[PDB]
């Protein structure tokens, strides 16, 4: 049901979503949206879990 | 490039580019449909047309 209702089915528009929940308005491009979703999560430097 | 860099957002979606331009394939089919010149910085050896 969470597919269901989801409105999205594919990646770059998932990321869209992502980029603009955190900071709306700036209309997104794809490389701020991956930069910005992969430095969230993933990156050594803004995210650490000791 | 820049079209799937702006192919996000669905404030404000794009179309294809192949409506807004011609392909480049396109284009060197127009022209052969029109009498051209090239000049050219260098020395072409011989023929005709030429």
Same mark, same amino acid.
């Given at each position: 049901?969470?597919?269901?209702?989801?409105?999205?089915?594919?990646?770059?528009?998932?990321?869209?979503?992502? *980029?603009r929940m955190m900071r709306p308005?700036?209309?997104?491009?794809?490389?701020?949206?991956?930069?910005?979703?992969?430095?969230?999560?993933?990156?050594?430097?803004? *995210?650490?879990?000791? | 490039?820049?079209?799937?860099?702006?192919?996000?957002?669905?404030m404000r979606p794009l179309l294809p580019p192949q409506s807004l331009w011609l392909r480049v394939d396109e284009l060197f089919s127009e022209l052969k449909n029109w009498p051209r010149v090239q000049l050219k910085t260098e020395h072409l050896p011989t023929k005709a047309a030429n």
């Open positions: 049901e969470t597919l269901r209702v989801d409105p999205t089915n594919d990646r770059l528009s998932a990321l869209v979503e992502i *980029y308005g700036e209309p997104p491009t794809r490389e701020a949206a991956e930069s910005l979703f992969e430095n969230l999560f993933f990156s050594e430097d803004r *995210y650490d879990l000791s | 490039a820049r079209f799937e860099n702006r192919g996000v957002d669905p």
